[PDB]
Structure 1
Amino acid sequence: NPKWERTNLTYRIRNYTPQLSEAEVERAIKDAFELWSVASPLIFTRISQGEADINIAFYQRDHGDNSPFDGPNGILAHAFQPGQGIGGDAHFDAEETWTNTSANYNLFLVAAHEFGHSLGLAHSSDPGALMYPNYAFRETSNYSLPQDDIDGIQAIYG
């Protein structure tokens, strides 16, 4: 079971998607990290440059990691378990339509799922859990972590 042995973790957004403003992309990402912080001892801090523990980027098809994206729909993004280098990093398929509405696909909810992986969680069979393998829209305005997900990070950290 891999976990971070440090509690303040830095993150960096390496590039952006044109469908959303830079401010909307930063808001989506920020809020997704907050979901996990309120249920664990982790604190996330944004750096504008340099080496972050968690790199976030929008890539297309082959992008250097041996797990190529597949164009519109299908796989939306992926993330690496806690660790050095690529460890903890999160990639989003630049070919998807990214939104901040109920329309396919809501960047905040997909980001919240990937960050679960960056922190060490695996998929859940509970269809109501954020860590479930298939994407499903749920209201986001005052969204909070499902109980199955809370049990999950609490079991790793505390």
Structure 2
Amino acid sequence: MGPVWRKHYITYRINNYTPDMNREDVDYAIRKAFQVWSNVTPLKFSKINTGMADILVVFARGAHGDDHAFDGKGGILAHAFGPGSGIGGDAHFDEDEFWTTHSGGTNLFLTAVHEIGHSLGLGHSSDPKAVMFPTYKYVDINTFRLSADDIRGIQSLYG
């Protein structure tokens, strides 16, 4: 393995909101995305509105302060840093994308699941069924499930 979180209780904070969606929708998509991963691991995720969280969720465009500039609409959608102090664990979403509760844009839920995988220490999967496979494909949020390879990946890091 590379790095992992050495604790099981992990906090996140939503730094700022995208204007593409309602604030309630953004909270919900993010909360469900963490739930995908807490469902298959010992990890507990807790939303914090003050103080400093382990995992900061940020919407930004272009050069946004971290040597990995976003690229305007399309292309790179998002990135996240592996477990660590400071910017480690943080997930950044390209505001030049159009974020959506369902399809017809870039689905925030699905992307957040992918990115949180990174935040927890996963790399990319060679398996096209896996959410950690590095191409975006819309699947209905209600029918989305982690693949065998996703779970095997995360359980090897956290039991």
Shorter-chain TM range is over 0.9
2:63 maps to 62
Report how many aligned residue pairs link the two structures: 158
Is 1:13 aligned to residue 45 of structure 2? no
Give the Cα separation in 1 of the matches to 2:7 and 2:92: 22
**Aligned equivalents of 1:63, 1:94: Cα separation in 2:** 11
* Cα drift, residue 19 of structure 1: 1.2
Unaligned 5+ segments in structure 1 are none
The 5 Å alignment of 1:7-156 reads: 7-156=8-157
TM-score normalized by the length of structure 1: 0.98
Per-residue deviation, residues 55-106 of structure 1 (Å, max 9, x unmatched): 0010010011000000000000000000000100000001111101121210
Whole-angstrom distance in 2 between the partners of 1:51 and 1:90: 14
Q: TM-score, normalised by structure 2?
A: 0.97
What's the secondary structure of 1:121's corresponding residue? Answer: coil
Identity in percent: 54
Name structure 2 gaps, 5 residues minimum: none
| Contact 2:100/2:106 (<8 A) preserved | yes
Runs of 4+ in 1 over 2 A off after TM superposition: none
RMSD: 0.7
